[PDB]
Design goal:
Chain A is α/β, with parallel strands linked by helices and 568 residues long. Helix content of chain A is 32%, strand content 12%. In chain A, α5 runs parallel beside α13 and α9 packs parallel to α13. The complex binds FE2/S2 (inorganic) cluster (3 copies) and magnesium ion (3 copies). Chains A, B, C: It comes from Paralcaligenes ureilyticus.
Amino acid sequence: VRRSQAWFGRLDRDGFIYRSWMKNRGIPHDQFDGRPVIGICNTFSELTPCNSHFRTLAEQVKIGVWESGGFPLEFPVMSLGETMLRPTAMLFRNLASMDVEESIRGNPLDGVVLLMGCDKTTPSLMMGAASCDLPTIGVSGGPMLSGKFRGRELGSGTDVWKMSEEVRAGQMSQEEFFEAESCMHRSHGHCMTMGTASTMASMVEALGMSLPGNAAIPAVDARRNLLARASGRRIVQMVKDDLVMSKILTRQAFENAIRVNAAIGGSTNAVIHLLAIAGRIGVDLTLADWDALGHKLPCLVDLQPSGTHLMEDFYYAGGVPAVIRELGDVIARDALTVNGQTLWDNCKDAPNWNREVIHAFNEPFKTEAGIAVLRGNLCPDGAVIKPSAATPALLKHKGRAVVFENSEHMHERMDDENLDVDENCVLVLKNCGPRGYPGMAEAGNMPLPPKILRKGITDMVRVSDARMSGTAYGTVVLHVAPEAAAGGPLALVQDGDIIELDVAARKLHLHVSDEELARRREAWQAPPAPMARGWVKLYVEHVQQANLGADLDFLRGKSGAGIPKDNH
Amino acid sequence: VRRSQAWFGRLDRDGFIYRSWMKNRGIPHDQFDGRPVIGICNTFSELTPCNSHFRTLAEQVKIGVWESGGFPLEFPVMSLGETMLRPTAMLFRNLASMDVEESIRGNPLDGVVLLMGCDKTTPSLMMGAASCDLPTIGVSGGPMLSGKFRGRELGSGTDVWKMSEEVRAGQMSQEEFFEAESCMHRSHGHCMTMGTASTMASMVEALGMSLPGNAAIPAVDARRNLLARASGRRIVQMVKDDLVMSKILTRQAFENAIRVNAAIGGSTNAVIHLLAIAGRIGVDLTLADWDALGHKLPCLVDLQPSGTHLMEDFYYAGGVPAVIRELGDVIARDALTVNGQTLWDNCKDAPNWNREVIHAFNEPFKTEAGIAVLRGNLCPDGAVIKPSAATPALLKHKGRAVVFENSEHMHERMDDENLDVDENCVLVLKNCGPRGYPGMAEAGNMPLPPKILRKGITDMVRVSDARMSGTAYGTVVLHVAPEAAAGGPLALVQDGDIIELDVAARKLHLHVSDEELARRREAWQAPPAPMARGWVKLYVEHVQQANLGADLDFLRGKSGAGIPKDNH
Amino acid sequence: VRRSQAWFGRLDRDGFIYRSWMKNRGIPHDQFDGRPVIGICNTFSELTPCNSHFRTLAEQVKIGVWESGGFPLEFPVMSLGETMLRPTAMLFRNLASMDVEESIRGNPLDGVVLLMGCDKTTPSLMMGAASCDLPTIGVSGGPMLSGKFRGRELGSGTDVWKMSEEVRAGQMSQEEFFEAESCMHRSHGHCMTMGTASTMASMVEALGMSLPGNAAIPAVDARRNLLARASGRRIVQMVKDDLVMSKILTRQAFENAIRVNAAIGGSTNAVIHLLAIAGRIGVDLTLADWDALGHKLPCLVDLQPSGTHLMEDFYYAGGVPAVIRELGDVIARDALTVNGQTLWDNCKDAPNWNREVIHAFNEPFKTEAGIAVLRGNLCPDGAVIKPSAATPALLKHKGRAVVFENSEHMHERMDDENLDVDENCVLVLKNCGPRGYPGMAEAGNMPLPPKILRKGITDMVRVSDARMSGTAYGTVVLHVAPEAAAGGPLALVQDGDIIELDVAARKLHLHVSDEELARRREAWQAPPAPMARGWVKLYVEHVQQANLGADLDFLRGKSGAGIPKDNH
Ligand code: FES
Ligand code: FES
Ligand code: FES
Ligand SMILES: [Mg+2]
Ligand SMILES: [Mg+2]
Ligand SMILES: [Mg+2]
C-alpha cells in the first residue's frame, strides 16, 4: 500500500469525499484503484516567459503516466520569472518551496514530477519535494534557441551586460542595443547561456534526479517532449520501486554535481541553491565543500559567459552526458540515478560531436576554473568567485577601495566623472544580501565607471554581499558573508581601504587593524525593517546567510510524506 | 502612469531585461506601450476538481482583455481543493494568500483578475489581492449541475452527511452509498448546495467585487464564460479609472455581504473569511458586527442545507441579484461595485422567475435565520451557530456534556455502545481549532452516536472549536474562541458538566464556577507542537483565533502595490 | 453591408436560428453587430505532422482579430500530410479544395485566413479560397529547424534520397540510415529544404498574399506567432477595405512569383500549383509563361537540393524579402500585397546578412537556373526540368531508352543485375501522371541502377509523366503531358529508342517517325479504371493534365461569395 490509497482506497464516509468530487470531470473509477497517482508540479506562467511552454510539457508527462498505468494530476505553485520578479526572484524562492512541499504532502500523491525551467523555479521545487522525500523526477524546460541578430549570435544575459557596457562606453549605439531584444529571444525555453537555469538543469541531471540528456535539450526541440514523456513513464515505475529522493540525493550525488559544475563553467548561484537543497533532503554539505570538491578541476565547456558558444551548440556536442564522460576518474561512478542505472552507466558511452565545445579532460577549455571560496577578515563565513569567466591578471590583485553603501548610492556615483576611481581600484557594494536588498539580488556584476570603459578596460575587481547572474562575468567576489546588513565586516569598508584578492591563496583580506574596525563598529546601526508586514517581514527575520543556502531557518530539513488527519 | 511602465517602459539596460525575455514567444512590441497589464490569477488544478475548468475561464478572460486593448498575463498560485488537501485546506489558506500577494506586487501588474471557485480559493485570493489594493475584479467558477441519482437529485456535501448518517443508522445500505458518488458530481464547478463556495461566490457579488450574476451561474452554462469575458473587458477600464479594492471593500460592502449571507442561508465559514478579508483591506469588522447586522434578517433561499433546492434552481430563479432586490430596505443601496454602478443599480430590476426558491421578504423561507454569535464563559471571544439549518426545538437547550478530547478520541468513543449518552446530552469536541488540529478542520458536525440514530434522532447539540462544512446542518455551535489548544475554557469541560445553549439570548454557558475552572486550568498543558519545522510550525506559532479571521499575525494588514527595486 | 449580416443581422426567424446556436458556448451579442467575421481555415492534423502546431497558430490569429474588433471563427478542412497520404497527396488536393471553397461560401465569413504548411495544404487552400474571392490572407506554418545528426546537418527529403542511394550503392550502412530519422526532423514545421512547402510559402509571399517575411520564419521561432497574430489584425482591415484576392492575384503577381521561384531554386511542383491557382482566380497563365519569365533568370539562394544550406540559414540571411530586393530590376514593383503596400515597398530596404546564402543578382549562386519547359513530339503539351539541381553535362544528352511500364515494373527491373543499361541511357517511366498512378506521385526521381551507383554515378537522364519531390534533384524531366495513360506519345516509347534532351534548345525529342508512332498507337489501350467508385473514380474521369494545373475540369474557375438561400 502507498499513501494515495489512504485517500482513494477508503471505504468510509471520507472515501466518498475523496473520490466523488474528483469524478466531476469524468475520471474512471479504476484510476482510484491504487495505481500510482503522479502529481505534476507545473510552474507554467505567462509571467515566467521561460516556463510559458510548460502546459505543452505537462500534457507530455501525462501521457507517459497514462501509458504506464498511472493516474496523472497536475497542480500549480507560485512561479518565479527572474526577469519579472522585483526586488528579485530569490526573495520568493523559499515561499515557492512551501507551495511545493505542502501541495505534495497535503494531496494523495505517490510520486512527483517537477517541471523546472527559469532559475528560481528549479531550487524551489527541488527544495519543497526534498522535504517530502516521495519518488520524484525532474523535467527541465530546456534552453532557448540561439539569438540571431544581424548575421551573428546573441547570448542570454551575457550579451545584455556586454552590449550595455558598450553603450555607456560610446562603442555601441543605444538604438542598436534596443533593436536586439526581439532577436536575442526568439524561442521557448530558459536563458540559453550557461546561466543559473542551464547549470541547475545540469545540476538536476548530474545529481541523478532526471533522465540522461535532460539539461541541454532545447525547449522547442522534439527530444524535450520525448524526455518529458519518458519521465512520465519512469515515475510510475519509480513509485512501484519506491525510489525516493534520498536514495538519489546522496553525499556522492552532490559531490558529482559540484564536479560537473566546475567542468561546465557553472553559475555561482548553484552554490547557494545546492546548499539549500542539501539542507532539506539531509545531506551534509557546507560551503567549504564547494572549494574542496571542485579543487583543481578544469572547465571543459567553451560556452558563454566563460567561453563563446551557446546552449544550442552544447546540446549538439553531447550535452551533460558527454561532460560526465570526461569526468570518469573524478566522479562517483556508482551513484544511482532515477532511471534505474548509475550515473556512469548512463554516460560511459556518451558521444562527443564537437571537441571545440566539450573538451577532453586532459586538454580542457580552462584549467583549475572551478568556483573558488575565499577566506579572510572581510568574509568570515566565506565568499565565492568564478574564475572561469574572470580575467587572469586580476585573480591576484590589490588596490584602493571605492565603496558604495547600496544600489541607489552606487548607480549615482558610478557615472560620476568626479569619482576618484582608477583601473586598479576595488569597487565595494554593501547591503545587497538576503536582509539588505532584501532577497540578495543579482547586482554583483556592477557596471564599471564610464571613464574606465572608454579606455578598453572591461573588468576590475569587485566585492559585494550580493549575487550576480549566472550569465555574468568578470573577477567578482560574491556572497560575502555575513552580509553588511547583518553586521558583517563588509559593512565597515571605507573609501581608500586596501583590499587584497588572491584566488590562488583563497585569500580576501581587508588591510585595516582590528582596533580600527572595532571602533568603526560603534557607529554601525542595523538597517530598518524593509516592511513591517507580509512575507518580506517573515523572510528578513528568518532568512539564513548565503553561506548556508539562503533558506529560512524554520524550513530547513524534511518531514517526510506521512498520512495526515482526515479533513472532516 | 502606472506600475507596469516601471518594467516595460524603461529606456536603459533594465528595459531590455524586462521586455526581451517576454518577447520569446512572439508578443508584439506595442503590448509594452503602457497599455494596462492585466494579471489573471489562475487557481486551475487537477487536484482542485472544482477549479479544473479554469483554463477555459482564463482564456475567456484573456479575450475580454485583448478586446479592450489590455495586456493579459496569467500566473499560478497554490490551489486549495477541499476534498483533497489534508489535514484541511484551511491550513494552507494563508500560504496561498502570500502567493497571491507577492505575485501581484512582484510582477508588472496594473490590475488583477481573480479566478476563484473551490471554498478556500476565494478568500485566499481576496486576502492577497486586498493586501496590494490594485484595481481587482473577481470571477467565480460557478457551481456544478444538480446531481441525478435514481430519478432523484443529490446535493453536494449535504447529502454526504445525510446518506452517511443513514448508513450508520442501518437505514441506507452501504451499497447505495458508494454507487451515488459518481452520480452526485456530474460536471465542472464547485459544490451545488449553499456551501462555502456558493456562499463565498455570493459574497464576492455582495461585496461588489464582481459583475452582477457572478455567483449563481453554473460552471458549464454559457453565461459563465460570458461573465469571465465581460470581466476581462471591465478590468482594463477599471485600471484606467483607478478603481482599487479600497473604493469597493468599504464597511457598507461588508455589511451588505453579511446581510445577503443571511438571506441566502450562507455558510458559517463566510464569517471567518470576511473577517480575514476585512483584516487585509483595513475595515473594522468584528464578530459582533455579524450578530447585529445578520440574525434578525430572514432566510429567503430554500436551498440545502437550510432548504431542499440546489444552486441550479437558485440561478434559474434569479440568483443573487434577485435576492438583493428583496433586501432593498436594509442594504446600503449606494455601495459602489466594480462595474461602475451601485449595488442597488445592478439589482433594482432583477427578475424573480421562481418564488418557491427565492422568497419575498415579507413571506420569507425561514424567520430570524441569520448566523448568531454566542457569548458566555465557555466562549469569551465568541462562537457562532447557523440556525437556518438547525433544529428549532434545540436552539434553547440544557444538557449533560459528553466530552471528546480530540477527533481521534471522538471516532473511538462515538460508536462505542457503552457510551453514556442520550439525545439530550451536549457533545463537546476539543482541540480542533487553528492550533489544535491544526488548521481548524470541518469536524463540528459530529456524527451522532449510532444508538441515537436508530431512534430516528438526527440532530443533537454539539460544541466544538472546529469549523463546519457550509453544506452541513444541525444545531452546532462553532468557532469557539479561544480554542482548547490555546487555553480557552473549552479545554476544561469534563463529562457531566451542564452546558446551557440559548441562541435567542446569545448565551453559551458552562455551569462550572470560576473557582473550579481555576483549579481545572492549573492541570491544563498546551498540546505539543504538531511539527517542529515547515509551514505547519509557522502556522501554529502565528495563526490568530477564529474570531479575528484565522489569519497569520504578520500578514494582517496591507502594504499597497509600490514599485520595488530593480532585480539586477 | 457584408455577407455576415445576411446571417447575424437578420431580424426574423432565421436570425434567431443563426445567432442562438452560436451563443451556446458564451459569445457576447456584440460579436454579431456587423464587425468582420473572420474564418480561420485550420489544416491542423496529427496525420499532417508539418501542420501539427497549427492549434497554436490558430489561437494567435484569433487574437489579432480580437485586437482589431473582428469575430474570429476557425473551421477545419481535409488536411494533406505529404508523407502519410497514399497513393499520393496530390490525389486529394482537389478534394480538399472543395472543402475550402464550400466552407467559405456556405458560412457567414467576410474575410478568410489560410493556415498552410505541408506541401499540398498551400495550393488546396489557395485554390478553394480563390474560387470565393473574399478578402483573404495566407499564413505559412514555417519550416522545421535544421536536422542535427552526428555533428553535421540533415536536410528534409533531399538527404532521404541521398542517404538511400548511398545505402543501395553500399556506401552507407542500413542501420545508420535509420538512426537518422529521429535526428532529421526534430521540431514542428514543414520541410527544412527548398522543397514544395518552402517554395509554396515563398510563392504566397511573392504573390503578395501574405505579410512580408512569411515564408522563411521557422515554425518554432517567436516571429512565426508574431506574423500569424499580425495577420489576424490585418485581415480585419482588409475586410473593411474589401481587398479581395483578385486585387492581389493579378497577372503581375503570378509573374513576380515565377521570378522569385527561379532565384530561390524552387520546386517543380510550384509550376503545377501556381497554374491551378491561376485557373481559379481567372488569370491566364501557361507553361510558356513559366519558361519565358524564368528564362535565364539566376538562382540566388544556396539551399538544398540546389545548394548546401537549409531554411534556417535562409531566414537568418534575409529570407524572401532579401531575394526580392535582388530582383528589383525585373519584378513588377507596383504589385499590391495584402498589407496595403506594394511588393517593392515591403522589400526595397530588406537587409542581407549572409551573401553566401542569398547571393547578389550579378554574382549569383547559379546562372540561368530557372525551370525550363521542354517541347517536342515526346511531350506535345510540355514538360519541365529543374536544372538548378541537375548535372550540367547531362542537360544536352542523347541516350538509348530503358523503359519501365509503371512504378511496379520499375521497382522490379531497376535492381535487376541483368538490366542492359549504362550511365548514358535515358530512363523512361510510364503511367505515373494524374490518371496513371492515379494522382501523379513523386516518382520522377528514379533511383539509379546499383551497378551504376557503385561506379560513382548519382545522376542519369530520366523522363516520366510523374512529379518530383521539391527536395529531389538530378537531370529529371517531369510533367510530360499528355501522360502515358491519357494516350500521350510517352506511352509508345520502347526499349532501344533514341531520346534527345537539350534544355538550352528547350527540346525533348523521341527519334521515332510519325508513321511508326501511328502503328504503335493502334496497339495502345487505356489502362483499366483504378477504382469503380469513390473519389478516385471522379478524379481519374475529370482531372486535367499537368500542363494546366492537374485541377478537376468542373472546378476550374470561380463563383464569388454571394449570399446563398436560407437553410430553413
Ligand atoms: S530568465 Fe528564465 S532563466 Fe534567465
Ligand atoms: S469541495 Fe470545492 S466547493 Fe466544497
Ligand atoms: S512533408 Fe509536409 S512539407 Fe514535405
Ligand atoms: Mg539568475
Ligand atoms: Mg469547506
Ligand atoms: Mg511534395
